[PDB]
Amino acid sequence: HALVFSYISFALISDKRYQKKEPLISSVHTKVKGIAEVKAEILENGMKKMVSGVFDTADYTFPLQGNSFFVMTNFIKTEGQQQGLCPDFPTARTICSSDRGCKKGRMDPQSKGIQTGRCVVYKERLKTCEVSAWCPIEEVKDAPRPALLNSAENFTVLIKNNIDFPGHNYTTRNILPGVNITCTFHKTQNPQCPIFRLGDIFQETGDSFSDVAIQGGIMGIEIYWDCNLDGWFHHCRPKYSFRRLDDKTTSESLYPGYNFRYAKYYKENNVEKRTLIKVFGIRFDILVFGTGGKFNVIQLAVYIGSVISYFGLATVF
Amino acid sequence: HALVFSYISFALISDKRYQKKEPLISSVHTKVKGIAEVKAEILENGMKKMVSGVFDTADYTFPLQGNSFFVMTNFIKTEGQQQGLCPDFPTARTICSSDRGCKKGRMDPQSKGIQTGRCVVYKERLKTCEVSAWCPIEEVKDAPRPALLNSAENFTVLIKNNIDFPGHNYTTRNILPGVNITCTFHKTQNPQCPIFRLGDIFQETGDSFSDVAIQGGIMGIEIYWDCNLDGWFHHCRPKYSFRRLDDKTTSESLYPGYNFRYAKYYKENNVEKRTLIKVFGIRFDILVFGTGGKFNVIQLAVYIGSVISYFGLATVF
Amino acid sequence: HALVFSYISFALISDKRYQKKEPLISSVHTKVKGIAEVKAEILENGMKKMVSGVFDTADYTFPLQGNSFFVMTNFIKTEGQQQGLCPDFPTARTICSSDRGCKKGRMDPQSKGIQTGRCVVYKERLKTCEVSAWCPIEEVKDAPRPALLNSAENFTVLIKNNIDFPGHNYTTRNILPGVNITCTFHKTQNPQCPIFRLGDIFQETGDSFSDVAIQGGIMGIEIYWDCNLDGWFHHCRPKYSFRRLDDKTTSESLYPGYNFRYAKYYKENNVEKRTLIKVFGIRFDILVFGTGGKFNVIQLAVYIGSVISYFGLATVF
Numbered sequence: 041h042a043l044v045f046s047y048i049s050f051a052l053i054s055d056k057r058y059q060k061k062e063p064l065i066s067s068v069h070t071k072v073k074g075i076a077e078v079k080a081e082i083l084e085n086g087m088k089k090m091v092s093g094v095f096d097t098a099d100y101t102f103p104l105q106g107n108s109f110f111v112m113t114n115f116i117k118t119e120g121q122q123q124g125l126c127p128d129f130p131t132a133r134t135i136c137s138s139d140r141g142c143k144k145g146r147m148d149p150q151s152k153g154i155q156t157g158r159c160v161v162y163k164e165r166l167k168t169c170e171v172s173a174w175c176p177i178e179e180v181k182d183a184p185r186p187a188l189l190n191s192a193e194n195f196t197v198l199i200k201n202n203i204d205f206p207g208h209n210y211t212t213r214n215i216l217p218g219v220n221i222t223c224t225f226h227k228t229q230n231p232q233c234p235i236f237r238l239g240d241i242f243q244e245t246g247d248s249f250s251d252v253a254i255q256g257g258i259m260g261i262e263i264y265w266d267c268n269l270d271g272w273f274h275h276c277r278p279k280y281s282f283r284r285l286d287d288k289t290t291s292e293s294l295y296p297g298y299n300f301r302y303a304k305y306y307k308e309n310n311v312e313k314r315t316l317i318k319v320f321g322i323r324f325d326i327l328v329f330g331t332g333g334k335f336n337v338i339q340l341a342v343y344i345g346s347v348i349s350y351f352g353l354a355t356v357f
Numbered sequence: 358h359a360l361v362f363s364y365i366s367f368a369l370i371s372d373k374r375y376q377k378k379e380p381l382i383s384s385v386h387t388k389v390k391g392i393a394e395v396k397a398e399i400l401e402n403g404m405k406k407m408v409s410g411v412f413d414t415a416d417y418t419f420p421l422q423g424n425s426f427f428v429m430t431n432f433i434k435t436e437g438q439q440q441g442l443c444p445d446f447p448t449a450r451t452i453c454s455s456d457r458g459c460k461k462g463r464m465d466p467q468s469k470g471i472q473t474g475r476c477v478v479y480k481e482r483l484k485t486c487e488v489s490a491w492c493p494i495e496e497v498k499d500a501p502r503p504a505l506l507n508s509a510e511n512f513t514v515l516i517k518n519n520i521d522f523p524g525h526n527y528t529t530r531n532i533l534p535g536v537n538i539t540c541t542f543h544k545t546q547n548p549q550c551p552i553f554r555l556g557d558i559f560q561e562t563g564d565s566f567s568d569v570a571i572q573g574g575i576m577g578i579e580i581y582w583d584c585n586l587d588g589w590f591h592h593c594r595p596k597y598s599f600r601r602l603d604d605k606t607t608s609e610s611l612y613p614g615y616n617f618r619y620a621k622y623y624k625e626n627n628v629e630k631r632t633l634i635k636v637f638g639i640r641f642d643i644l645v646f647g648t649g650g651k652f653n654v655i656q657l658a659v660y661i662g663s664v665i666s667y668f669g670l671a672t673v674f
Numbered sequence: 675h676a677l678v679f680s681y682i683s684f685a686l687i688s689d690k691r692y693q694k695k696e697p698l699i700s701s702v703h704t705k706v707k708g709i710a711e712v713k714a715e716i717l718e719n720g721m722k723k724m725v726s727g728v729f730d731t732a733d734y735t736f737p738l739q740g741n742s743f744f745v746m747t748n749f750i751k752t753e754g755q756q757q758g759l760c761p762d763f764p765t766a767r768t769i770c771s772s773d774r775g776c777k778k779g780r781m782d783p784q785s786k787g788i789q790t791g792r793c794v795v796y797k798e799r800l801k802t803c804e805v806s807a808w809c810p811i812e813e814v815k816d817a818p819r820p821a822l823l824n825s826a827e828n829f830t831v832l833i834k835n836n837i838d839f840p841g842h843n844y845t846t847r848n849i850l851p852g853v854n855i856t857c858t859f860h861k862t863q864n865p866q867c868p869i870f871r872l873g874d875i876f877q878e879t880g881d882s883f884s885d886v887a888i889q890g891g892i893m894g895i896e897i898y899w900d901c902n903l904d905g906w907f908h909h910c911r912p913k914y915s916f917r918r919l920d921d922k923t924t925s926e927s928l929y930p931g932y933n934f935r936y937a938k939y940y941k942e943n944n945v946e947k948r949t950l951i952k953v954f955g956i957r958f959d960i961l962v963f964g965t966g967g968k969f970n971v972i973q974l975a976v977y978i979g980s981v982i983s984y985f986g987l988a989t990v991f
């Protein structure tokens with residue numbers, strides 16, 4: 041009976057049911073640092089070409105939108121596209137022996153254009169279905185074998201997180217005043233340090249940064265707040281963890297990795313032209329969750345209300 | 358009395374109050390497919406002009422930011438704007454009979470410029486208030502009567518959703534391994550299929566895609582997770598539903614539809630110039646909510662605590 | 675004993691524990707209005723230059739992404755950058771007396787390039803470490819002393835918020851039909867008016883708009899919904915409040931304010947070139963939280979269950 045008292049009172053103190061919990065409010069602001077020197081040889085349209093240059097912040101990233109930031113790690117670039125009629129790139133689905141294999145007006149999911157219904161030669165005696173689109177069509181090619189921006193492991197993301205509890209009227213931030221900002225977060229050595237290294241993040245979740253960097257991925261940074269708003273035992277600091285949100289399907293149908301197509305439009309010799317750029321990289325999604333607990337009398341009285349009956353019943357035995 | 362027992366125990370099992378519920382964590386990744394052939398005749402500056410071309414992914418959409426993606430469906434384009442002094446476009450608010458109707462330095466919400474205080478002729482004998490801005494001012498014109506990108510119904514959005522329950526340590530994803538990816542979601546035939554057709558989405562919520570596509574809108578895709586983390590009766594799959602978030606006010610003051618203005622800057626003959634583009638389209642907002650429930654002894658003991666007293670009182674009658 | 679009855683029943687009615695509460699679903703759509711005339715004298719590369727022009731929506735803002743919109747308020751612009759070898763900008767960390775102070779291949783966090791290991795003259799007899807990057811390197815300079823877009827206080831943000839409660843199946847919006855849209859929100863005079871003035875927002879939270887506008891900041895607009903879904907006492911309207919999320923650290927290490935670097939790429943004389951633009955401004959983060967309460971019998975029965983025992987114990991005294 042008395043042990044039932046100590047187990048009830050303990051279950052209260054341990055589950056903090058005397059306290060009232062409120063969901064956290066998060067605001068995220070990120071600043072990425074690091075530059076990458078890129079020298080690589082890429083085969084474009086069957087001809088060897090040299091990609092050289094230095095990439096800084098403006099070249100490979102943009103500001104965080106919606107509690108997430110992206111870092112480009114690789115890219116394929118098709119230049120000089122213009123509105124016109126060209127043979128689709130030779131694939132299992134685009135190759136015609138005769139004009140009959142091509143259907144006029146047909147649109148294919150793999151194709152970036154609308155067929156004209158006429159079989160044409162893409163190169164040599166190989167024939168594909170002529171299409172109307174931005175010409176020439178981007179090659180169905182693989183990403184560069186070493187990620188051009190493979191240096192992105194050494195890049196550094198600084199995270200500033202502000203969390204508010206309205207009902208308890210308690211506002212705090214990720215970074216406290218006076219903390220030594222010159223640190224790299226470590227699971228043990230500097231768990232509070234907001235400075236993060238991307239490669240470190242990938243190792244923590246057990247993934248190689250380079251591999252993901254070749255085709256792209258979606259990493260995830262979790263910030264946990266177990267915040268206790270009582271003056272007796274008070275605590276409210278974040279706990280950083282890392283999880284890979286990327287599906288890692290590795291199936292052509294599921295469109296694996298993270299990549300997107302964006303174009304830059306220009307005019308030349310009184311002709312509208314466009315440079316298509318396939319972009320591969322790791323999107324980092326910041327997930328901040330929390331709970332704020334401050335003692336509430338009504339909740340304690342309701343638990344008391346369950347406990348009184350629990351006690352009578354324990355006495356009955 | 359005994360029926361009070363079966364109704365209490367039933368109310369427990371039915372409300373699952375033996376279980377503890379935890380809020381879901383959602384990450385969203387989307388890939389849009391489809392291309393649109395656009396041939397239309399648009400009246401620009403009182404002269405007929407022909408808009409022709411093929412639009413692919415890079416031409417009409419950009420990657421999802423903040424659990425939402427946008428698809429352009431129509432656009433008005435004003436080209437060659439440069440810093441200068443020009444008469445405002447003739448409206449009810451911009452027309453002056455004399456230099457006195459124009460106030461120097463005045464800014465109007467409808468106007469894109471600052472008045473110079475001088476009445477000038479916009480065309481013929483019609484006079485408007487001269488303003489300082491990007492010239493010439495975009496016409497106060499309606500969107501193209503058929504949406505140029507009216508084909509966007511036939512476009513296809515693939516959604517990959519990853520949800521995590523930290524406190525229960527349970528991570529799952531929208532798309533399971535081995536599922537037939539070649540499907541279009543149907544309310545009955547393929548409710549689990551993540552492939553979605555935009556026109557289907559509009560029909561489900563009872564709106565015509567074309568109409569919204571002319572002036573823009575905000576559609577909403579709801580993903581519900583009623584996830585039960587007990588091994589006895591286990592279940593954790595999404596339920597897709599569609600709701601129109603757009604306000605549909607249809608009042609000039611409320612700025613109805615979804616549209617925005619963005620510009621491309623270029624130089625010509627040593628003069629800075631800019632192409633303003635009004636963009637209309639449907640923004641799709643993905644809303645994922647969920648609840649994960651796994652049996653908890655303390656919660657069951659608290660409900661027990663309410664129930665014991667409820668029982669004594671039922672015996673009193 | 676009876677006062678314990680009135681205090682229990684009161685605690686119920688006051689905490690509404692008869693009701694069941696459900697978390698709110700928010701969708702945000704914003705439209706910004708206002709234009710700014712910018713005339714200012716900026717010292718660029720040690721030479722005086724004149725910035726003049728009119729800025730409209732497309733020039734200083736872009737559409738909301740992830741329940742947040744940004745308004746540029748100031749900017750520094752470095753033009754003509756091209757891939758090459760140039761001396762880093764003279765700072766405490768970049769200045770070399772001899773070729774020995776520079777380490778070949780070294781990358782510094784303050785530097786935007788990779789050192790070649792050779793000491794060179796930046797200007798006159800002052801020597802910095804030669805680096806490989808976009809040349810010339812942007813000056814380590816302060817933002818313009820008056821914010822070029824200092825007029826942004828007078829700018830107007832219109833907010834349309836749609837909130838849904840799925841479990842209660844109740845959908846409502848921020849803006850009701852027939853409301854006088856011609857208003858500016860006031861703490862007292864027009865608390866429901868969704869039209870907001872940015873300067874008003876800064877005064878409400880007790881910050882000067884101009885100061886923040888010089889170096890950038892992150893403002894926050896909170897929308898509270900205390901929604902009661904019972905027909906007896908029904909209410910469901912928003913309560914707007916303003917909080918400054920910006921950390922206001924004012925330390926060079928913490929990267930204070932809100933700013934980002936973005937570039938525009940062009941070709942000249944068969945040379946790839948780039949215009950780097952440092953952008954300063956206030957990001958406004960919209961935070962919508964809410965709770966919907968509709969009477970639930972099971973919850974009332976559980977509270978009853980605590981209360982019956984509470985009553986027996988009160989009788990024991």
Ligand SMILES: Cc1ccc(CN2CCNCC2)cc1NC(=O)CNc1ccc(F)c(F)c1
Pocket residue numbers: 092093094098099100101102110111112115317319757939946
């Ligand atoms: C994509 C790219 C390719 C080549 C080069 C340098 N070249 C050209 C000059 N000479 C050296 C070699 C720079 C860039 N970077 C950009 O264009 C910036 N745009 C951007 C694209 C996607 C993003 F995700 C993002 F954040 C920002």
Ligand SMILES: Cc1ccc(CN2CCNCC2)cc1NC(=O)CNc1ccc(F)c(F)c1
Pocket residue numbers: 123305312409410411415416417418419427428429432634636
């Ligand atoms: C807006 C536009 C107008 C005309 C054309 C083709 N023209 C020009 C060549 N000849 C054929 C006719 C293409 C585009 N598309 C873009 O500029 C891409 N930019 C963009 C704009 C808003 C978006 F929402 C978005 F996702 C991406």
Ligand SMILES: Cc1ccc(CN2CCNCC2)cc1NC(=O)CNc1ccc(F)c(F)c1
Pocket residue numbers: 440622629726727728732733734735736744745746749951953
């Ligand atoms: C940055 C800037 C500098 C100067 C001028 C006008 N100049 C040039 C013509 N003559 C007058 C003086 C316009 C703009 N605005 C843009 O380039 C628009 N891009 C943009 C940049 C950041 C943003 F946050 C955003 F929302 C949009």
Ligand SMILES: *[C@@H]1O[C@H](CO)[C@@H](O)[C@H](O)[C@H]1NC(C)=O
Pocket residue numbers: 190191192193194
């Ligand atoms: C990252 O830095 C280390 C140490 O400077 C270097 O050894 C490594 O090669 C760098 N990573 C890449 C991809 O170059």
Ligand SMILES: *[C@@H]1O[C@H](CO)[C@@H](O)[C@H](O)[C@H]1NC(C)=O
Pocket residue numbers: 209
């Ligand atoms: C929150 O607490 C502070 C403590 O100083 C107080 O000044 C402030 O008024 C409180 N907030 C509200 C909304 O009352």
Ligand SMILES: *[C@@H]1O[C@H](CO)[C@@H](O)[C@H](O)[C@H]1NC(C)=O
Pocket residue numbers: 220221222
């Ligand atoms: C921060 O720590 C580093 C080494 O971890 C040290 O070199 C530096 O002086 C410290 N800064 C301060 C302000 O204590």
Ligand SMILES: *[C@@H]1O[C@H](CO)[C@@H](O)[C@H](O)[C@H]1NC(C)=O
Pocket residue numbers: 507508509510511
């Ligand atoms: C969508 O596809 C169907 C079938 O191919 C076609 O009949 C319809 O016209 C298409 N929609 C538009 C807007 O062209």
Ligand SMILES: *[C@@H]1O[C@H](CO)[C@@H](O)[C@H](O)[C@H]1NC(C)=O
Pocket residue numbers: 526
């Ligand atoms: C979550 O469960 C898995 C089950 O294998 C376990 O390996 C993992 O360590 C658990 N997570 C934590 C944080 O303990």
Ligand SMILES: *[C@@H]1O[C@H](CO)[C@@H](O)[C@H](O)[C@H]1NC(C)=O
Pocket residue numbers: 537538539
């Ligand atoms: C998927 O279903 C389609 C028809 O609905 C069928 O043609 C196709 O072969 C199926 N794929 C697999 C792998 O079963």
Ligand SMILES: *[C@@H]1O[C@H](CO)[C@@H](O)[C@H](O)[C@H]1NC(C)=O
Pocket residue numbers: 824825826827828
């Ligand atoms: C905002 O408008 C007021 C009234 O027109 C004006 O006095 C003030 O100077 C304006 N703000 C700026 C920064 O010009």
Ligand SMILES: *[C@@H]1O[C@H](CO)[C@@H](O)[C@H](O)[C@H]1NC(C)=O
Pocket residue numbers: 843
């Ligand atoms: C929500 O309530 C309305 C009331 O008219 C009803 O028509 C609708 O079917 C309800 N929603 C669901 C999912 O039943």
Ligand SMILES: *[C@@H]1O[C@H](CO)[C@@H](O)[C@H](O)[C@H]1NC(C)=O
Pocket residue numbers: 854855856
């Ligand atoms: C709205 O209020 C303003 C003044 O606050 C008034 O001038 C205007 O006529 C009102 N509009 C309507 C429709 O009542």
